[PDB]
Write the structure tokens for this entry.
Amino acid sequence: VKQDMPPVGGYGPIDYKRNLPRRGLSGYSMFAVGIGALLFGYWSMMRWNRERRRLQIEDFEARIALMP
Amino acid sequence: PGIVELPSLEDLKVQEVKVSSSVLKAAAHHYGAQCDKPNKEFMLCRWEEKDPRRCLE
């Protein structure tokens, strides 16, 4: 009998592919998302700014009527 | 040159409205609405004649 170490029954395949799935989407979608979220933030910032303008005018009314 | 004419302490003693300032701010809008009608006369007296000791009444 012989007791070397051959490949017992053959070994299966071994990959060597450059498998890069390319996660993400196209860049035009990235520009669309960026400009959309940016403009969303601009509109919300505009609304909050003019609300605080209203309250700032009310504080001006306080300092005007409080003075004499 | 010339002497100053500063008025008397017996005319310069009126009881203040000795409230604190935060409540004075908190009641300011209705203080400007109903009252503060004859003090634009006071403020016009001040801006026309720029002499405190002249418009103190």
